[PDB]
Amino acid sequence: TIDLADGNYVVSRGDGWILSRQNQILGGSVISNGSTGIVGDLRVNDNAIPYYYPTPSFNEEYIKNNIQTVFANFTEANQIPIGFEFSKTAPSNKNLYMYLQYTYIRYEIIKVLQHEIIERAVLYVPSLGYVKSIEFNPGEKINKDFYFLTNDKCILEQFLYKKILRV
Amino acid sequence: TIDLADGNYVVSRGDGWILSRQNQILGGSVISNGSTGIVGDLRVNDNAIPYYYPTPSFNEEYIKNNIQTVFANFTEANQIPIGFEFSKTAPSNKNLYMYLQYTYIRYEIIKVLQHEIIERAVLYVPSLGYVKSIEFNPGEKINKDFYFLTNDKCILNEQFLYKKILETQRVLPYSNGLYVINKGDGYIRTNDKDLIGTLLIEAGSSGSIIQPRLRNTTRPLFTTSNDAKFSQQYTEERLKDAFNVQLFNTSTSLFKFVEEAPSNKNICIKAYNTYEKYELIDYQNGSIVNKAEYYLPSLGYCEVTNAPSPESEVVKTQVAEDGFIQNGPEEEIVVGVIDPSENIQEINTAISDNYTYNIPGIVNNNPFYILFTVNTTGIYKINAQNNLPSLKIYEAIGSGNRNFQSGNLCDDDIKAINYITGFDSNAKSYLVVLLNKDKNYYIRVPQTSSNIENQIKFKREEGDLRNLMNSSVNIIDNLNSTGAHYYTRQSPDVHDYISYEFTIPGNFNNKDTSNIRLYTSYNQGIGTLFRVTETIDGYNLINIQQNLNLLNSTKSIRLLNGAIYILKVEVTELNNYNIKLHIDITN
């Protein structure tokens, strides 16, 4: 129930979106006592493929053009490789497991009739990534919510919108 | 002198061997006045290159094959560059000379006659390096043993792993289907078959083992029980369905390990390559009828060790059996997947308060799914004609978060599903479930052996039936005589419901009240009880005896005959895969 006038809106929900079920598909580092683990990635070619979820009247070309008109030109940026890395040190006598995810920028194209969203198309642009770590003991029960994500969510949370037309 | 029976033995003497006369001098750096010197290499193409020292009995191919059968495959492991680095900071007002060598893995193959070694062949497999440094002053004599090594020697760990050359339970309440189980990360193989390598760091220095991904190739492992069905391609497709795994034998993800030794003693770090273990199981009628295991390459494992006491003899230990060791945290994530051999029909219109679905002829009486979405969050009763067959309701994981249009179905093509309710059986039940506004659900219809068409009704229930949320109301029809009736169904998980609707035998006159005994045989469950009055718009439920304890309960409740009663059981302890309810009638 958005508080917006009728029409189509291009919306940015900000960087920091981690996708569901896609948590440990890149693996994780296990660090023993004292050691330091540095896990990184470097977005070039296949790590930089946007994911479109289109709806009728909002096709892929529509989403791409309207997103890039008012927000970052992800097609141009994704050509330039960009690296990132996370460093973490294990305690004096403990084991530390830390796994890596990809973060995405969530873009939307929404249709507002009256004051209700009646149509939404989504686009995910891979931004950087995110390392999640825990300390564990041999034979310790770890909460399932640490490993598995059921719904997409933002780890960082905004709603930017634009209506689509001296001497 | 050895204490092994006569024959041939493949022997690993550990990692961290320094060659004589410092084979392939490389030089060192002179640092001064608190500056830090960092020296490293990258084992890729010539820095690799195993050194063979054959014997007439053991030729080069003999050594290569026999070593690689038991221990790590160096031929396919030296094709992936691996980096190492050593960092040392000079004191405030002195000069420090660093000095780099390569360490190797010694791989003797020995022929034993009597209790003696008569033939030995040595294979030096290249490994990470070793930096030695000294603090020096101008015009100061330095010992030659710091500079020149006369004989081969090991610096890391005394080790002798030999093998003989041969002249050749738990009750799972899962519904029937295919599941993918993430069973944790950090799996390594036995006998150091995944060992990237070991660094020895002197006191007050830093050492690092790096995977720079100069080659993207990896090597997943796979073990199937029925290659006809669960082939490697099939398992990869099911992994893609479950956890959306895209890259299997390719990875672009750096990982490196750094360790600074304390200023008083030395340290060692072992780096291993690890695997994430996935089990693809076909689970039918309470037993795992098929299973495959996929080990996806992961981001390594670091182990920090200290050198043992200097006065310690070696022990000739035998190699361990082939297998996996989990160095990571305990994990078990079970995700059901849509069977790709079963058709999926769709309902493109969001379901309003009523809807009926006609079974198409293209199905041809086969198990299949119906994808559908619900217009407004609420409790729905889903059934077939005369409640035959019994359906199973699933739920797409992560559906509804992404794009959507109001009033229609946005097929997200998500094939990871959560079982909600349903019986896998001729059992006359109907589902009462709670469905949301944007999530996609699958109604699974089993194999029907009748040529007559079937209709599936999706009635939204705004009434007293909401008490039976997320429950498959089973219909008890063969209740017409006194006795000890028993019904066996698939037992729901803990804190999950299963309902039983029955009409007491005998005519109804608000009299002739009989005694009814309720109890389960194996699984303890809290029971409710409702009476049903037949209205024109739905079912009106009035509460009767609440909060029963049903595990072999000894109680009789006075129920007048000819009326309809619903018993709702919530399982609190799962002892059997099948729940087993008893309806006993006494006059």
Beta strands B578-586 and B513-520, pairing class: antiparallel
Angle at B519 between CA B518 and CA B524, to 5 degrees: 140
Residues of A in contact with B439 (CB under 8 A): none
Distance, in Å, from the CA atom of B357 to the CA atom of B455, rounded to the nearest integer, reads 6
End-to-end CA distance of chain A: 54
State the CB neighbour count (10 A cutoff) for residue B200: 24
Distance, in Å, from the CA atom of B222 to the CA atom of B448, rounded to the nearest integer, reads 36
Distance, in Å, from the CA atom of B249 to the CA atom of B326, rounded to the nearest integer, reads 21
Per-residue H/E/C for B40-90: EEEECCCCCCCEEECCCCCCHHHHHHHHHHHCCCHHHHCCCCEEEEEEEEC
CA-nearest of B385, B563, B383, B397 to B472 is B383
Residues of A in contact with B276 (CB under 8 A): 24, 27-28
Q: Does B403 touch chain A (CB under 8 A)?
A: yes
CA-nearest of B101, B124, B103 to B53 is B124
Q: What is the residue-wise DSSP string for B272-296?
A: E--EEEEEEEEEETTEEEEEEEEEE
Residues of B in contact with A30 (CB under 8 A): 185-186, 274, 300-302, 327-328
Cβ separation B398–A152 shorter than 8 A? yes
Q: For residue B142, what are its two tokens?
A: 């330095």
Distance, in Å, from the CA atom of B356 to the CA atom of B384, rounded to the nearest integer, reads 9
Q: Does A36 touch chain B (CB under 8 A)?
A: yes
Query: How much is the CA Rg of chain A, to the nearest whole Å?
Result: 20
CA-nearest of A11, A8, A3, A22 to A149 is A22
Do the beta carbons of residue B4 and residue B316 sit within 8 Å? yes
Preceding peptide of B173 cis, ω within 30°: no
In A97-136, the residues whose Cβ lies within 8 Å of chain B are 97, 99-100, 116-122, 134, 136
Q: Does A148 touch chain B (CB under 8 A)?
A: yes
Which of A1, A22, A26, A140 is best to mutate for the B interface (most B CBs within 10 A)? A26
Do the beta carbons of residue A151 and residue B401 sit within 8 Å? yes
C-alpha distances out from residue B454 to B383, B388, B425, Å: 10, 8, 16
Do the beta carbons of residue B568 and residue B528 sit within 8 Å? yes
Q: Does B479 touch chain A (CB under 8 A)?
A: no
Q: Does B221 touch chain A (CB under 8 A)?
A: no
Distance, in Å, from the CA atom of B294 to the CA atom of B312, rounded to the nearest integer, reads 41
Q: Which runs of E-coded beta strand occur in B69-157? A: 82-89, 95-106, 109-113, 116-136, 153-154
- Residue with tokens 């004292």, as numbered in its chain: A34
Cβ separation B401–A151 shorter than 8 A? yes
> A–B: how many Cβ contacts below 8 A?
158
Distance, in Å, from the CA atom of B464 to the CA atom of B360, rounded to the nearest integer, reads 33
Question: Residues 6 or more apart from B394 whose CB is under 8 A from it?
Answer: B336, B369, B417, B418, B419, B420, B441, B442, B443, B444
Report how far Cα A95 is from the mean position of its chain's Cα atoms: 28
CA dihedral B68, B72, B75, B81 (to 10 degrees): -170
DSSP H helical segments within chain A, as ranges? 60-70, 74-77, 144-147
Beta bridge partners of B175: none
State the CB neighbour count (10 A cutoff) for residue A18: 18
C-alpha distances out from residue B158 to B162, B309, B313, B319, B394, Å: 13, 11, 8, 15, 57
- Residue with tokens 């008893």, as numbered in its chain: B582
State the CB neighbour count (10 A cutoff) for residue B403: 21
Cβ separation B259–A85 shorter than 8 A? no
Cβ separation A29–B302 shorter than 8 A? yes
Burial class, B470, CB count within 10 angstroms (exposed 0-12 / middle 13-18 / buried 19+): middle
Distance, in Å, from the CA atom of B84 to the CA atom of B101, rounded to the nearest integer, reads 12
User: Counting every residue, how long is chain B?
Assistant: 587
Distance, in Å, from the CA atom of A146 to the CA atom of B333, rounded to the nearest integer, reads 11
DSSP assignment letter at A25: S
CA-nearest of B197, B213, B199 to B86 is B199
User: Counting every residue, how long is chain A?
Assistant: 167
Distance, in Å, from the CA atom of B540 to the CA atom of A68, rounded to the nearest integer, reads 57
Cβ separation A140–B244 shorter than 8 A? no
Q: What is the residue-wise DSSP string for B210-252?
A: EE--SS-B---EEEES-TTTS-HHHHHHHHHHHH----SSB--
C-alpha distances out from residue B232 to A15, B324, B334, Å: 36, 19, 20
Sign of CA dihedral B133, B136, B138, B141: negative
Classified as helix, coil or strand, B112 is strand
Residues of B in contact with A100 (CB under 8 A): 253, 299
Residues of A in contact with B254 (CB under 8 A): 38-42, 85
Cβ separation B258–A35 shorter than 8 A? yes
Phi/psi at B108 (nearest 5 deg)?
A: -55, 140
Angle at B108 between CA B102 and CA B109, to 5 degrees: 155
Cβ separation B242–A100 shorter than 8 A? no
Distance, in Å, from the CA atom of B394 to the CA atom of B392, rounded to the nearest integer, reads 7
Q: For residue A103, what are its two tokens?
A: 């973060």
Q: Does B301 touch chain A (CB under 8 A)?
A: yes
Cβ separation A29–B301 shorter than 8 A? yes
Angle at B33 between CA B29 and CA B36, to 5 degrees: 50
DSSP H helical segments within A83-161, as ranges? 144-147
Residues of A in contact with B257 (CB under 8 A): 31, 35-38
Cβ separation B257–A34 shorter than 8 A? no
Report how far Cα B557 is from the mean position of its chain's Cα atoms: 48
Q: Which runs of E-coded beta strand occur in chain A? A: 7-12, 17-18, 28-31, 36-43, 51-53, 82-89, 95-101, 104-113, 116-126, 130-136, 153-154, 160-163
Phi/psi at B237 (nearest 5 deg)?
A: -65, -40
State the CB neighbour count (10 A cutoff) for residue B478: 8
Do the beta carbons of residue B539 and residue B463 sit within 8 Å? yes
Classified as helix, coil or strand, B342 is coil
Q: For residue B84, what are its two tokens?
A: 């190492």
Q: Report the chain A residue with the minimal C-alpha distance to residue B180.
A: A21
Residues of B in contact with A32 (CB under 8 A): 301-304
Q: Does A92 touch chain B (CB under 8 A)?
A: no
Cβ separation A27–B242 shorter than 8 A? no
Identify how the structure was determined: cryo-EM
Q: For residue B251, what are its two tokens?
A: 């990875």
C-alpha distances out from residue B505 to B97, B530, B534, B551, Å: 98, 17, 17, 24
Distance, in Å, from the CA atom of B48 to the CA atom of B24, rounded to the nearest integer, reads 12
Breaks in chain B after (C-N > 2.5 angstroms): 168, 425
Q: Report the chain B residue with the minimal C-alpha distance to residue A57.
A: B405
Do the beta carbons of residue B475 and residue B387 sit within 8 Å? yes
Q: For residue B515, what are its two tokens?
A: 């005694």
Do the beta carbons of residue B580 and residue B571 sit within 8 Å? no
Do the beta carbons of residue B460 and residue B404 sit within 8 Å? no
- Residue with tokens 């738990």, as numbered in its chain: B170
End-to-end CA distance of chain B: 89
Question: Residues 6 or more apart from B158 whose CB is under 8 A from it?
Answer: B14, B308, B312, B314
Residues of B in contact with A151 (CB under 8 A): 398, 401
